[PDB]
């Protein structure tokens, strides 16, 4: 018999195809309380949902929630939030790519509420041909101040 078990890994883990390895609980000889150590070999690019496989277990790789990237197959999207001001006058933040490198983001021109920037070959690797990566997309999400004061309104001209 085969039972499904979910295995939350991280985008970074899947990216490098790390030899993630953990122990899982089961029964044993004549009813018991065990914990057996298993070894999973991830592969650069593995998409969640993939599965690698006494008793029998069916493992389904699962993408943990990354604090900066939202994945799209082979593409990676990063949503850089922006203060109202820096949304029309410019900004000079800095972001960390999926592989540790830090990337300088910067404008001196207003940016459209959902305007994006695509960086080729800077996303997750492609499972089939891994020597190829998808690409990073950085989305600017401008933040509006709630109710605005008198000066504010008057100024808007």
């Amino acid at each position: 018999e085969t039972v499904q078990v979910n295995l939350p890994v991280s985008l970074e883990d899947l990216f490098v195809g790390k030899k993630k390895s953990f122990k899982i609980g089961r029964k044993g000889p004549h009813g018991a309380s065990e914990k057996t150590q298993i070894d999973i070999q991830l592969k650069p690019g593995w998409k969640a949902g993939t599965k690698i496989t006494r008793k029998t277990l069916q493992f389904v790789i699962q993408e943990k929630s990354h604090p900066n990237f939202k994945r799209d197959g082979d593409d990676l999207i990063y949503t850089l939030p922006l203060s109202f001001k820096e949304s029309l006058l410019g900004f000079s933040k800095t972001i960390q790519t999926i592989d540790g490198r830090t990337l300088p983001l910067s404008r001196v021109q207003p940016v459209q509420p959902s305007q994006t920037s695509t960086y080729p070959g800077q996303g997750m690797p492609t499972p089939k041909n891994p020597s190829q990566r998808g690409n990073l997309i950085v989305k600017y999400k401008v933040d509006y101040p709630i109710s605005l004061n008198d000066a504010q309104k008057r100024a808007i001209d």
């Binding site: 039972v3 078990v5 979910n6 295995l7 390895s21 953990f22 122990k23 899982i24 609980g25 089961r26 914990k35 150590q37 277990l57």
Partner: peptide, 7 residues
Amino acid sequence: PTVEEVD
């Protein structure tokens, strides 16, 4: 529901 244990 088994017991997942990372490593």
